[PDB]
Structure formats: structure tokens, C-alpha cells
Design a protein around this ligand. Sequence first.
Ligand SMILES: Cn1ccc2ccc(C(=O)O)cc21
Length: 209
Amino acid sequence: EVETFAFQAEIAQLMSLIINTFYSNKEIFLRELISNSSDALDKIRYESLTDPSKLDSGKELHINLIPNKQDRTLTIVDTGIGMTKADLINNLGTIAKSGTKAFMEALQAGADISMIGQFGVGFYSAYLVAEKVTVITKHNDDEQYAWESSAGGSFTVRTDTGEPMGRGTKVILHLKEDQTEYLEERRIKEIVKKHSQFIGYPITLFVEK
Ligand SMILES: Cn1ccc2ccc(C(=O)O)cc21
């Protein structure tokens, strides 16, 4: 049972800008997703301070980076607070309408796309390198869901009956054919070292057979 939704016009416009603007510094997508994971982990850690049972769905707070060259996917997994179905539908838990407004004003004033996270809409930088993004998520207060979009103005949401996640979010980047450098160990290590040095959770880069 798959529900298809239209993005809000402003978010479709954000996505089209990210996909169509010439802009070479695409590697910042990984910084932005890791920052989103860190923010999600901070949230479940805060809730656990007064309610330890919030970690019954998983005590370890971490981020895994999983490249798969056969599937052409880079997966960012975190064990943070996760998203409810409403969060997914409401722009993956962001205030993306007002964030997009500010971001586009900043761009016209001289900012560049690398500054997207300052506007709270860093998730959509995934579309710098991905033709399709799939988000699997599980919040303590809801079932497990899959969100997906190849842009083009719509996204889908379904209940996910696949591999159970415990708690947190998994962003599966189906990379564009010319962006496979982001599956290479040395390239991922370089970007994490450059941009994510002060993320306060373990970031494990999986290796491939
Ligand atoms: C890939 N994978 C790992 C654990 C697991 C459990 C269920 C399913 C499924 O498709 O139901 C897939 C799974």
C-alpha cells in the first residue's frame, strides 16, 4: 500500500535548483547527512536522560556509512530518534518551506549551495549526487516506514515490512552514474575527515568484498 504525495511547491523548487544548478562542490551532501544524523542522535540521547527506556530499541548511538558498488548505493544509517509517518510527510521533520525561502534569498545575495545546512534543509543536498533517495525510518512512537523520491515533484510513503531497524534512520542514496566516486573508501574517508571532524558519535565506514 503505497501513498504518493506532491511536494510543496517551494520544496519541489528547492529540489529542482539542487539538481539543475551547475555546482561542482557536491561532496558536501555527506557532511549534511551526517549532521542530520548527529542531530537525530542528540534528540534520542536527550530524551534518554530522563527516560532510560527510550533506549530499549537500541542503546548504541552511532552512524554507519555503507557503500555498495553492485547496487550503486551509499547508505547513511544512524540510531537516532527516527521519524514518525507525519514527520516524513512534513518534509522529513524540517521546516523546509521557510528554510527554502531563506536559502534561496541567500543564494541570490551571493551564498552558495554548500551553505544549505544553515537553512535547515541539508537533507535535500542528497540530490546533488543521487537520482533516487530512499529513507527508512523507525521512531519509538510509530511503525517502520519507507519514504522515497526521484524528485519530479512527488514522493511516496509506505509501511516497511523489510529488515527491522530497531530505531533510527537509514538514507539510501541511489547514486547518479557519474557520482560513483562516493562509493570509494579513500574518497569517503577524505570527506568525513574534512567536514565531520567534530561529530560526537562513532562513524564507521564499512568496507566491501
Ligand atoms: C535484508 N534483511 C535483513 C533482515 C531482514 C528481515 C526481514 C526482511 C524482509 O524482507 O522481510 C529482510 C531482511
